[PDB]
Design a protein around this motif. Structure first.
Motif, PDB file in Angstrom:
ATOM      1  N   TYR A  77      14.864 -16.673  28.981  1.00 26.99           N
ATOM      2  CA  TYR A  77      14.236 -15.362  29.059  1.00 26.99           C
ATOM      3  C   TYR A  77      12.729 -15.507  29.227  1.00 26.99           C
ATOM      4  O   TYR A  77      12.119 -16.488  28.791  1.00 26.99           O
ATOM      5  N   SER A  78      12.132 -14.497  29.856  1.00 24.21           N
ATOM      6  CA  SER A  78      10.690 -14.446  30.043  1.00 24.21           C
ATOM      7  C   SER A  78      10.238 -12.993  30.094  1.00 24.21           C
ATOM      8  O   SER A  78      11.020 -12.095  30.419  1.00 24.21           O
ATOM      9  N   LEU A  79       8.964 -12.780  29.773  1.00 21.99           N
ATOM     10  CA  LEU A  79       8.355 -11.456  29.806  1.00 21.99           C
ATOM     11  C   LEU A  79       6.840 -11.610  29.737  1.00 21.99           C
ATOM     12  O   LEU A  79       6.310 -12.718  29.616  1.00 21.99           O
ATOM     13  N   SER A  80       6.142 -10.479  29.818  1.00 15.93           N
ATOM     14  CA  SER A  80       4.692 -10.455  29.713  1.00 15.93           C
ATOM     15  C   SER A  80       4.264  -9.286  28.839  1.00 15.93           C
ATOM     16  O   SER A  80       4.892  -8.224  28.841  1.00 15.93           O
ATOM     17  N   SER A  81       3.184  -9.495  28.090  1.00 13.55           N
ATOM     18  CA  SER A  81       2.575  -8.451  27.273  1.00 13.55           C
ATOM     19  C   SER A  81       1.121  -8.324  27.693  1.00 13.55           C
ATOM     20  O   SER A  81       0.331  -9.247  27.475  1.00 13.55           O
ATOM     21  N   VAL A  82       0.770  -7.187  28.293  1.00 15.51           N
ATOM     22  CA  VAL A  82      -0.547  -6.999  28.885  1.00 15.51           C
ATOM     23  C   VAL A  82      -1.278  -5.887  28.146  1.00 15.51           C
ATOM     24  O   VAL A  82      -0.683  -5.098  27.409  1.00 15.51           O
ATOM     25  N   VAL A  83      -2.592  -5.837  28.349  1.00 11.84           N
ATOM     26  CA  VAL A  83      -3.436  -4.800  27.771  1.00 11.84           C
ATOM     27  C   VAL A  83      -4.674  -4.629  28.645  1.00 11.84           C
ATOM     28  O   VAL A  83      -5.230  -5.606  29.165  1.00 11.84           O
TER      29      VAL A  83
ATOM     30  N   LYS B 258       7.603 -17.373  28.031  1.00 13.72           N
ATOM     31  CA  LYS B 258       8.594 -17.981  28.903  1.00 13.72           C
ATOM     32  C   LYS B 258       9.503 -18.902  28.101  1.00 13.72           C
ATOM     33  O   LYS B 258       9.100 -19.456  27.073  1.00 13.72           O
ATOM     34  N   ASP B 259      10.737 -19.052  28.586  1.00 20.34           N
ATOM     35  CA  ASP B 259      11.653 -20.099  28.131  1.00 20.34           C
ATOM     36  C   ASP B 259      11.983 -19.952  26.644  1.00 20.34           C
ATOM     37  O   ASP B 259      11.696 -20.827  25.823  1.00 20.34           O
ATOM     38  N   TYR B 260      12.599 -18.822  26.305  1.00 21.56           N
ATOM     39  CA  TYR B 260      13.085 -18.607  24.952  1.00 21.56           C
ATOM     40  C   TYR B 260      14.510 -18.082  25.007  1.00 21.56           C
ATOM     41  O   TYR B 260      14.970 -17.569  26.030  1.00 21.56           O
ATOM     42  N   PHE B 261      15.208 -18.224  23.877  1.00 25.20           N
ATOM     43  CA  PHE B 261      16.584 -17.775  23.743  1.00 25.20           C
ATOM     44  C   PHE B 261      16.934 -17.790  22.268  1.00 25.20           C
ATOM     45  O   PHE B 261      16.610 -18.769  21.584  1.00 25.20           O
ATOM     46  N   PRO B 262      17.572 -16.737  21.736  1.00 25.95           N
ATOM     47  CA  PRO B 262      17.855 -15.481  22.432  1.00 25.95           C
ATOM     48  C   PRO B 262      16.912 -14.351  22.029  1.00 25.95           C
ATOM     49  O   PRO B 262      15.940 -14.573  21.308  1.00 25.95           O
ATOM     50  N   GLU B 263      17.219 -13.145  22.500  1.00 27.33           N
ATOM     51  CA  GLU B 263      16.495 -11.956  22.095  1.00 27.33           C
ATOM     52  C   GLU B 263      16.731 -11.680  20.610  1.00 27.33           C
ATOM     53  O   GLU B 263      17.747 -12.096  20.047  1.00 27.33           O
ATOM     54  N   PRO B 264      15.804 -10.969  19.945  1.00 30.85           N
ATOM     55  CA  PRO B 264      14.541 -10.424  20.452  1.00 30.85           C
ATOM     56  C   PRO B 264      13.352 -11.357  20.264  1.00 30.85           C
ATOM     57  O   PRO B 264      13.511 -12.511  19.869  1.00 30.85           O
ATOM     58  N   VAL B 265      12.159 -10.835  20.548  1.00 26.48           N
ATOM     59  CA  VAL B 265      10.913 -11.550  20.305  1.00 26.48           C
ATOM     60  C   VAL B 265       9.844 -10.503  20.038  1.00 26.48           C
ATOM     61  O   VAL B 265       9.859  -9.418  20.627  1.00 26.48           O
TER      62      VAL B 265
END
Lengths: 148, 231, 215, 225, 216
Positions: D185-191, D152-159
């Protein structure tokens, strides 16, 4: 595009008008005459050119246009193309892609004697009355009567 | 009203050239939107457009036959000439010449185009043979007494070339139960047709029957008498 | 090329009902390029409708049309016996301009029982080296009927010809002639010749046979 | 060797100026119909500007008065000047050739560039934050459990997100990042892994952000209720 | 001001299938249109010129047709690398009438798989800074169509759901979905139970996933 100060393929590589153009343009649709049921391909236009034409300049050159660094020797290829293209006139084509016949008249007045201009409007002839008369530029006042 | 009539040699040997001429009256080849079309139709199969000519000398031809198609116009005498080269024996057909005109109303909208009146059409047969007289064979009725009071008889016309053959019975006196089948082309480029008339069984012998064959290209007029035969 | 298909291949009705025909285009083009023409028996085709939406000069209002895209239809409401003929649909979209294969309008009637008559080659033909035996099918409805030639109870094939005439204007029936041609060697090496017919109105196939030696 | 390469992209503050370069090889920029077309991220294509061989230029309604196109013959390059940009200008720009191809494709685009990214935002570039998403307290559940990390809470892309330093790649889902209402920006990485492996094996979550140079490594461990 | 409508928006097909893609214009444009193919992560490629002429270097399996206000593209055999986005673009109006169409995407067709549902409540570490994120995750479903609703203490919620979806994986060609609610700690402490309801075509009945904050 056929007007002073315009831009476009026709205005640049087909027909360019001077910015101080004198005279003017009469144009009308001619779909009933210039259209064929199978498609009329008799009218061409220049699509590829290096630079714009000067006013009142025509170009009938039909050399192959070079679109790259390799100079072709007169045979078309991936970057060598014919600079003239045929129109897709079809009588059912919508308004905007229909043939139009265009005439442009330009009036030139030089130090030479003026020669081309409109008819002179004459009136009737009356006699036996004091009138103002003008015959062939000769003006006067008086009574006109029959002579011997 | 307009009229368009075809003319030209109807008998053409294989792999020579053929030339047809259409004469048209009631219209001229100078009016805007006026054209002339040439079309052909093989017997028994659908129509096939051949060529189109415009008032402004524009020409249109079939893409497949454009190699061996030519069309010319004569405005003063009002004629259209169509020429084909290297004729094929499978080109036997009937040819029509037609008028062409499109509809516009003061605004150039083109309410469709059509094929307004055509020509009469001329028959063209391309085969390698010589004209010879027809032969008539009497197909007599079978030896039956009544069979319910109905029998039939007639004639078989064979070995004629080219078409057509006109067959009459009693010089056209009888028209009831008269059937003349269309002529069929045999493998040897030869023709044969049949003319059958139905008669009552009790009328087999009380009336003599004559069948007349006429063949203009062979100039043949032959009358054959048909009577029943016994065992 | 642009291919136009007419549906159905053959449409037969009685005088009085409505007739519907369809013309489908292989590709898609303007609806103003599609027209319909009428051709009778032994007569030149005439303009019927143009633009797929306009009637020609003098064309009766019974004839109408409607269509778009790649499919068009023609409608007749009250047909008279003077319009049983062939109809063609035509396009102007792309050269070459092609005609439809045509659909024949046939007058419908009752099923008729045909008569089979045998005509052996005569003496005038039995001297030229070639003989022709012809058997006649008469007054059969509909046009469909199968004939088979046989010699000495052996079914021949590929050596006979057939001819069918135009539909009778008084009975709406048909006449069919079957001919079998042979030579002198092929004629005198057998005894009995026959033709057998199957028809829709026939309960069982009917064979007509003849013996040359007997009669 | 017809080749078109774009350059000059990047991130700019709103209302600024920017310059794009299109380098063309084996074709002549001064003698051919050249085009600039921008495509918004995830949206369709949209023509922006065109230049003729003779020098005439056209711009579309939304960009006219702010976008300029020019050519360079010595460098055989195309230059695109952006004045008074806006957030709606953030897209990917393609340098294209008009009216080309072997069959005389008039007005058809057969040659493009690799594209350049232009971003217009004032999101105060910073580093990401990483939070755990531990699996629920379940025994087997059919031998299926899911865990992951929330960035959460990053700028800018990518990551860049990795698990166990590259030891795990199977069953990994990296959802596309979503731009929030606050501009970040926010995202999730799941497994998804079997339940029995949740107690013995160790899990390492690594998130790396280049513009902020933030490298965060942490551990995701199930909790008790 | 010409606009084009491309149908379908998305098409599902397998290897070796025939694909027909149409696009329609608000006005007749003769044949001034071209069909392009663009794959994700690269610029578009010209396939068909003048809506009927195959470009050089293009496989012959593709073909184009149509006229006026309707244009069609036909693919006989869909090779495994034919899965991309397809576009049709016009050049009818001369001066500045260049406009673009919608587009059609083609994806791999397979059977129906039931998604697996998981939940992640906000952690204590995130709640240290006064933010809470509730995550509902669905795995391995096909096709992508589904609906997800949120229930805060048995109440309907909308306008605060952020959803992300995964492109088809190279082995299963299914989709993964993750929805989240972001809230302040003041609003999160006030309620007790939270839930996500999911409804899918592969699900006979919608599946709930609920958790009580007080319990765990």
């Amino acid at each position: 595009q056929i007007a002073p100060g315009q831009t476009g393929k026709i205005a640049d590589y087909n027909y360019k008008l001077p910015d101080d153009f004198t005279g003017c343009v009469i144009a009308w649709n001619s779909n009933n005459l210039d259209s064929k049921v199978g498609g009329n391909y008799n009218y061409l236009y220049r699509l590829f050119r290096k630079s714009n034409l000067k006013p009142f300049e025509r170009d009938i050159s039909t050399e192959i246009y070079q679109a790259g660094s390799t100079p072709c020797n007169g045979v078309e290829g991936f970057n060598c193309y014919f600079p003239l293209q045929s129109y897709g006139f079809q009588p059912t084509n919508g308004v905007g892609y229909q043939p139009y016949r265009v005439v442009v008249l330009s009036f030139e007045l030089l130090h030479a004697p003026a020669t081309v201009c409109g008819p002179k409007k004459s009136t009737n002839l009356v006699k036996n009355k004091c009138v103002n008369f003008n015959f062939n530029g000769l003006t006067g006042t008086g009574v006109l009567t029959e002579s011997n | 009203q307009i009229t368009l009539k075809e003319s030209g040699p109807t008998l053409v040997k294989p792999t020579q050239t053929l030339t047809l001429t259409c004469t048209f009256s009631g219209f001229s080849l100078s009016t805007s939107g006026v054209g002339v079309a040439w079309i052909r139709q093989p017997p028994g199969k659908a129509l096939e457009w051949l060529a189109l000519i415009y008032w402004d000398n524009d020409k249109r031809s079939s893409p497949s036959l454009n190699n061996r198609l030519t069309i010319t116009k004569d405005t003063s005498k009002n004629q259209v000439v169509l020429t084909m080269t290297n004729m094929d024996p499978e080109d036997t057909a009937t040819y029509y010449c037609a008028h062409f005109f499109s509809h516009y109303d003061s605004s150039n909208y083109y309410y469709g185009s059509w094929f307004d009146p055509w020509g009469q059409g001329t028959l063209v047969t391309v085969s390698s043979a010589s004209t010879k007289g027809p032969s008539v064979f009497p197909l007599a009725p079978s030896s039956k007494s009544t069979s319910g009071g109905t029998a039939a008889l007639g004639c078989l016309v064979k070995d004629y070339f080219p078409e057509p053959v006109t067959v009459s019975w009693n010089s056209g006196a009888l028209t009831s139960g008269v059937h003349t089948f269309p002529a069929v082309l045999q493998s040897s480029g030869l023709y044969s047709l049949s003319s059958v008339v139905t008669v009552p069984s009790s009328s087999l012998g009380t009336q003599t029957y004559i069948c007349n064959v006429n063949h203009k290209p062979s100039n043949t007029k032959v009358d054959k008498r048909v009577e029943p035969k016994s065992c | 090329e642009i291919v136009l298909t007419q549906s159905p291949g053959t449409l037969s009705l009685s005088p009085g009902e409505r007739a519907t025909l369809s013309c489908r285009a292989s590709q898609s083009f303007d609806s103003r390029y599609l027209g319909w023409y009428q051709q009778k028996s032994g007569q030149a085709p005439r303009l019927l409708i143009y633009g797929a939406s306009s009637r020609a000069t003098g064309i009766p209002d019974r004839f109408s049309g409607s269509g778009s895209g790649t499919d068009f239809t023609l409608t007749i409401s009250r047909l008279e016996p003077e319009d049983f003929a062939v109809y063609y649909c035509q396009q102007f979209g792309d050269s070459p301009f092609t005609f439809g294969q045509g659909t024949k309008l046939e007058i419908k009637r009752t099923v008729a029982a045909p008569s089979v008559f045998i005509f052996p080659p005569s003496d005038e033909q039995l001297k030229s080296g070639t003989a022709s035996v012809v058997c006649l099918l008469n007054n059969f409805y509909p046009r469909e009927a199968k004939v088979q030639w046989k010699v000495d109870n052996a079914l021949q094939s590929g050596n006979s010809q057939e001819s069918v005439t135009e539909q009778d204007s008084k009975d709406s029936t048909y006449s069919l002639s079957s001919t079998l041609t042979l030579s002198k060697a092929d004629y005198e090496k057998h005894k009995v010749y026959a033709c057998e017919v199957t028809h829709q109105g026939l309960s069982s196939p009917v064979t007509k046979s003849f013996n040359r030696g007997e009669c | 060797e017809v080749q078109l390469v774009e350059s000059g992209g990047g991130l700019v503050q709103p209302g600024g100026s920017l310059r794009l370069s299109c380098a063309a090889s084996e074709i002549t920029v001064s003698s051919n119909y050249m085009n600039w077309v921008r495509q918004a991220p995830g949206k369709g294509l949209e023509w922006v500007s065109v230049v003729y061989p003779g020098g005439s230029t056209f711009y579309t309604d939304s960009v006219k008065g702010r976008f300029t196109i020019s050519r360079d013959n010595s460098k055989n390059t195309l230059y695109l000047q952006m004045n008074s940009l806006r957030a709606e200008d953030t897209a990917v720009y393609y340098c294209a050739r008009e009216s080309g191809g072997f069959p005389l494709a008039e007005g058809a685009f057969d040659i493009w560039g690799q594209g350049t990214m232009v971003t217009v935002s004032s999101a105060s570039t910073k580093g990401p934050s990483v939070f755990p998403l531990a699996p629920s307290s379940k025994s087997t559940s059919g031998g299926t459990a899911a865990l992951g990390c929330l960035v959460k809470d990053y700028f800018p892309e990518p990551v860049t997100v990795s698990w166990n330093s590259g030891a795990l790649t199977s069953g990994v889902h990296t959802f596309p990042a979503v731009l929030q209402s606050s501009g970040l920006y926010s995202l999730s990485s799941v497994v998804t892994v079997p339940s029995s492996s949740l107690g013995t094996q160790t899990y390492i979550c690594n998130v790396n952000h280049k513009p902020s140079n933030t490298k965060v490594d942490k551990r995701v461990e199930p909790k008790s209720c």
